[PDB]
Design an enzyme around this catalytic site. Structure first.
Site, PDB file in Angstrom:
ATOM      1  N   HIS A 199       0.727  -1.141  -0.028  1.00 39.31           N
ATOM      2  CA  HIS A 199      -0.043  -0.058   0.115  1.00 39.31           C
ATOM      3  C   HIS A 199       0.801   1.142   0.056  1.00 39.31           C
ATOM      4  CE1 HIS A 199      -3.647   2.371   0.588  1.00 39.31           C
ATOM      5  NE2 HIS A 199      -2.812   3.228   1.316  1.00 39.31           N
ATOM      6  N   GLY A 200       0.807   2.055  -1.023  1.00 34.38           N
ATOM      7  CA  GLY A 200       1.555   3.009  -1.280  1.00 34.38           C
ATOM      8  C   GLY A 200       0.972   4.295  -0.966  1.00 34.38           C
ATOM      9  N   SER A 201       1.347   5.578  -0.390  1.00 38.54           N
ATOM     10  CA  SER A 201       0.727   6.585  -0.440  1.00 38.54           C
ATOM     11  C   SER A 201       1.842   7.817  -0.064  1.00 38.54           C
ATOM     12  CB  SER A 201      -0.179   6.739   0.936  1.00 38.54           C
ATOM     13  OG  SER A 201      -1.538   7.114   0.968  1.00 38.54           O
ATOM     14  N   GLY A 208      -1.196  10.265   9.761  1.00 40.42           N
ATOM     15  CA  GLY A 208      -2.431   9.972   9.908  1.00 40.42           C
ATOM     16  C   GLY A 208      -2.785   8.496   9.484  1.00 40.42           C
ATOM     17  N   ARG A 215      -7.900   3.994   5.979  1.00 41.42           N
ATOM     18  CA  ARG A 215      -9.540   4.114   6.168  1.00 41.42           C
ATOM     19  C   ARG A 215     -10.099   4.139   4.740  1.00 41.42           C
ATOM     20  NH1 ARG A 215      -5.567   8.032   7.759  1.00 41.42           N
ATOM     21  NH2 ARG A 215      -5.465   7.160   5.834  1.00 41.42           N
ATOM     22  N   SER A 241       2.221  -0.016  -6.027  1.00 37.23           N
ATOM     23  CA  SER A 241       1.966   0.756  -4.975  1.00 37.23           C
ATOM     24  C   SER A 241       3.068   1.745  -4.771  1.00 37.23           C
ATOM     25  CB  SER A 241       1.798  -0.181  -3.643  1.00 37.23           C
ATOM     26  OG  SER A 241       0.748  -0.887  -3.535  1.00 37.23           O
ATOM     27  N   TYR A 244       2.159   5.330  -6.038  1.00 37.33           N
ATOM     28  CA  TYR A 244       1.341   6.135  -5.087  1.00 37.33           C
ATOM     29  C   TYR A 244       2.357   7.095  -4.610  1.00 37.33           C
ATOM     30  CZ  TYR A 244      -2.744   3.996  -7.470  1.00 37.33           C
ATOM     31  OH  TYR A 244      -3.627   3.654  -8.355  1.00 37.33           O
ATOM     32  N   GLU A 325      -4.517  -6.340  -8.020  1.00 40.41           N
ATOM     33  CA  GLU A 325      -5.097  -5.417  -7.082  1.00 40.41           C
ATOM     34  C   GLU A 325      -6.264  -5.868  -5.951  1.00 40.41           C
ATOM     35  OE1 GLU A 325      -7.957  -1.810  -8.426  1.00 40.41           O
ATOM     36  OE2 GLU A 325      -5.970  -1.609  -9.428  1.00 40.41           O
TER      37      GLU A 325
END
Ligand SMILES: CNCc1ccc(-c2[nH]c3cc(F)cc4c3c2CCNC4=O)cc1
Length: 347
Positions: A199-201, A208, A215, A241, A244, A325
């Site tokens: 999971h990439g952000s 957060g 979330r 990921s 992102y 995914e």
């Protein structure tokens, strides 16, 4: 004054840097005189989502130009942008609403992070103070450990051919455990098919993410762009990921996650569908990609199957997805295990 390891100290500094929060906001074209970091609030982002949802329905219904203008103007009134000479881009299509909605997703986590930073008791080293604010235990995985080896192999092997713009380097591997997340996930641990996924952000979100976990987008948020509805999205391909992270030559260090995800009965889907309600028996959605990680090379880390198999071809050629995914629609179906500090090497 803090006894915390330098990589952890360096991580707290990074995920709480207020300048990178502002730098993000500026890139987003936001007017920082009318909309400074402080003035940014949960209620306005909620309101803004609602306007974007209205713009979507206006586009769906094929409403008047007057309607779409007033609607577009209402958004920019709420989230003031600064283009100088340039007139504000009209929100009159799916890409436009998707774009602005993704901005709001980011602004929301930025607000979460800035609020967290300003809040609490004001002694104790600030780096220690902010580490405690994250309510997440962060331990450093040894470079020369069996753990690190498994992880780095997953990074090396599931780096796609298409994402040939960069070369990933694992600077730091962190073993993380969010406060109370383990108890939350414990009922979904009974489900079969627990995989370790990516999971990439954007780095601005990670305060957060550690604070409140991953979330799902609120009801207010437009359903546009979410290929499989509002849920928590994951990849078995590090590249997918890593994209992102929104890294560049400028800022080449980004953060990625490894999370234990209870998929159970996967609803294997070829093309896009805004779900809302999953079929009776199913617990997740698997977007079947044309390239799958070698199944005959699946490993078991802490009794969780890691698909670190090299990028091989899947039997499905009648699909709209290039890579696999995974989507869960209950936030308790996730238990975050690792946070990786990656250096992106461009060409
Ligand atoms: C409007 N925003 C729509 C949207 C935004 C992000 C994502 C998304 N899909 C993913 C699939 C996947 F496999 C991995 C990831 C994502 C994301 C974004 C979150 N990070 C992922 O690594 C999907 C849809």
């Amino acid at each position: 004054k803090s006894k915390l390891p330098k990589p952890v100290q360096d991580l707290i500094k990074m995920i709480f840097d207020v300048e990178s929060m502002k730098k993000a906001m500026v890139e987003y074209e936001i007017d920082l005189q009318k909309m400074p970091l402080g003035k940014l609030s949960k209620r306005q982002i909620q309101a803004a989502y609602s306007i974007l949802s209205e713009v979507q329905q206006a586009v769906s219904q094929g409403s008047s130009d007057s309607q779409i203008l007033d609607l577009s103007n209402r958004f920019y009134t709420l989230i003031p942008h600064d283009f100088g000479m340039k007139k504000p881009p009209l929100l009159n299509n799916a890409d436009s609403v998707q774009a602005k909605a993704e901005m709001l997703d980011n602004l929301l986590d930025i607000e979460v992070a800035y609020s967290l930073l300003r809040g609490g008791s004001d002694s104790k080293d600030p780096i220690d103070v902010n580490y405690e604010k994250l309510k997440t235990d962060i331990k450093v995985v040894d470079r020369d450990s069996e753990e690190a080896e498994i992880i780095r192999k997953y990074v090396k092997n599931t780096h796609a051919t298409t994402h040939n713009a960069y070369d990933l380097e694992v600077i730091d591997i962190f073993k993380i455990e969010r406060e109370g997340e383990c108890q939350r996930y414990k009922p979904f641990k009974q489900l079969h098919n627990r995989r370790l996924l990516w999971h990439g952000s954007r780095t601005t979100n990670f305060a957060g993410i550690l604070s409140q976990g991953l979330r799902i987008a609120p009801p207010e948020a437009p359903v546009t762009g979410y290929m499989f509805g509002k849920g928590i999205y994951f990849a078995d391909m590090v590249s997918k990921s890593a994209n992102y992270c929104h890294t560049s030559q400028g800022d080449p260090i980004g953060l990625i996650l490894l999370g234990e995800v209870a998929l159970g009965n996967m609803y294997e889907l070829k093309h896009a569908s805004h779900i809302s309600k999953l079929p009776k028996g199913k617990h997740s959605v698997k977007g079947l990609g044309k390239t799958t990680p070698d199944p005959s090379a699946n490993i078991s880390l802490d009794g969780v199957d890691v698909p670190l198999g090299t990028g091989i071809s899947s039997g499905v050629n009648d699909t709209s997805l290039l890579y696999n995914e995974y989507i869960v629609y209950d936030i308790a179906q996730v238990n975050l295990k690792y946070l990786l500090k990656l250096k992106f090497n461009f060409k």
